[PDB]
Design a protein around this nucleic acid. Structure first.
Ligand SMILES: Nc1ccn([C@@H]2O[C@H](COP(=O)(O)OP(=O)(O)OP(=O)(O)O)[C@@H](O)[C@H]2O)c(=O)n1
Ligand SMILES: [Ca+2]
Ligand SMILES: [K+]
Length: 430
DNA sequence: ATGATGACGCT
DNA sequence: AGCGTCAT
């Protein structure tokens, strides 16, 4: 009862750019705006692989990982933009730079955790407290939340989407206790007003639209963000959790989309997150380990403590390329040449990073996949990264991997390589 | 023949 | 260290 923590101590948001690479290419090329369009990498094999899809193209069934030639079967008018290719590999620099535009706007409002090229978590607790003092108890207008959905409302005793949105928002605001400055529901609402402001600024200053979730922790914020996409934000209160989780497949919760989530389902014989509440913490720890069991016990009640880490820059900087099918690398010369190509792009990004961010990497990790290995990495070895020089870095990578060559011939490479990966890690300030 | 990254857990 | 998991 009175001692039972409810995980309502923080306001956390997750911001996710809608069809990010598509928005970048549509900003650059107005002919792509408001059209079914997709972003593709490479082109010779089956038209290239689709990596991002506009909402207009998704209505036709186009998805990520589709070959562009197949996507054109679903959507003959599909417009395509191609990822830059440099040194024979995809080069994502345009999207990384657009991402920096967005993250630097977000950092004005609060400290952010870069979660991916196009997602950041925001810890808003402190900004909320401040804005609450600026309010002095005045009600929060629905005009301050023009794109906000309150998950689970409307409820109780119109047939259009926006009318539903406004109805739920009104019920929520009508029930708010704007007098109590430590009300969790009030704090989430203020958090949502701030996130509206953040999203307005991102759109004004970059042209890019995003969705967001606002809740009390990262898992609920991420789940919230996915509930109303694109160009909308969703508030998931602590009170909404029982109904939301009662039909929510377990695999939808961040970190449960893989083998652990499958084993939760199979060992416990359940399907939905809320069903987890019927097990004791010790039962869950017995099945899934002490850490996982504690996490699941708290999470299925809507409680999570993973902090928004203050980290706006990636921790490692890497370059990778796959060599599928008949293109697998089968000679010494081939392996060396592609290691040089990867290392040249890596040198370029590292030099940029050292100038921009005042740091230097100190370890080089070299990862390969061999033909027939189902695993995504067959081997990983490290060496010292002492100078930002592509020829040295590629020579060192070759050195640390060369005894993997089975061939008795000095010039051949067996088994052939289906993946090369260079990653610079262990950054020190400079 | 999805392909390009990136973080973190386990041992 | 080196591998496995999960994600965007
Ligand atoms: N299997 C995946 C999924 C995502 N990404 C990377 O993560 C970025 C954002 O992924 P995601 O948010 O899932 O896709 P969006 O295009 O942004 O679509 P949405 O509107 O649903 O956010 C992609 O552009 C891509 O760079 C990737 O490389 N491989
Ligand atoms: Ca996105
Ligand atoms: K994303």
């Amino acid at each position: 009862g009175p001692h039972m923590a409810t995980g309502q101590d923080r306001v956390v948001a997750l911001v996710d750019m809608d069809c990010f690479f598509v928005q970048v290419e549509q900003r650059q090329n107005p002919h792509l705006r408001n059209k079914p369009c997709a972003v593709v990498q490479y082109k010779s094999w089956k038209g290239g692989g689709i990596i991002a899809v506009s909402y207009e193209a998704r209505a036709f069934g186009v998805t990520r990982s589709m070959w562009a030639d197949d996507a054109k079967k679903l959507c003959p008018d599909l417009l395509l933009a191609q990822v830059r290719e440099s040194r024979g590999k995809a080069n994502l620099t345009k999207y990384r730079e657009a991402s920096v535009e967005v993250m630097e706007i977000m950092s004005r409002f609060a400290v952010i955790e870069r979660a991916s090229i196009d997602e950041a978590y925001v810890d808003l607790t402190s900004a909320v407290q401040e804005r609450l003092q600026k309010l002095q108890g005045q009600p929060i207008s629905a005009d301050l939340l023009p794109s906000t959905y309150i998950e689970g409302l409307p409820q109780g005793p119109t047939v259009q989407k926006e009318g539903m949105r406004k109805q739920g928002l009104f019920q929520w605001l009508d029930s708010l206790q704007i007098d109590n400055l430590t009300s969790p529901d009030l704090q989430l609402t203020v958090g949502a007003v701030i996130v509206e402001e953040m999203r307005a600024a991102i759109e004004r200053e970059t042209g890019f639209q995003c969705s967001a979730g606002i809740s009390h922790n990262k898992v609920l914020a991420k789940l919230a963000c996915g509930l109303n996409k694109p160009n909308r934000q969703t508030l998931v209160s602590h009170g909404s959790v029982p109904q939301l989780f009662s039909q929510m497949p377990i695999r939808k919760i961040r970190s449960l989309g893989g083998k652990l989530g499958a084993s939760v389902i199979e060992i416990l014989g359940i399907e939905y997150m809320g069903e987890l509440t019927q097990f004791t913490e010790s039962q869950l720890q017995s099945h899934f380990g002490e850490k996982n069991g504690s996490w699941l016990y708290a999470m299925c009640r809507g409680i999570e403590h993973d902090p928004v880490k203050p980290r706006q820059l990636p921790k490692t900087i890497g370059c990778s390329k796959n060599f599928p099918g008949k293109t697998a690398l089968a000679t010494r010369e081939q392996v060396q040449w592609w290691l040089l190509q990867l290392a040249q792009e890596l040198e370029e990004r590292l030099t940029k990073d050292r100038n921009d961010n005042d740091r230097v990497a100190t370890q080089l990790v070299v990862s390969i996949r061999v033909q027939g290995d189902k695993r995504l990495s067959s081997l990983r070895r490290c060496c010292a990264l002492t100078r930002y020089d592509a020829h040295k870095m590629s020579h060192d990578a070759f050195t640390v991997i060369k005894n993997c060559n089975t061939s008795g011939i000095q010039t051949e490479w067996s088994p052939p390589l289906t993946m090369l990966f260079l990653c610079a890690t262990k950054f020190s300030a400079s």
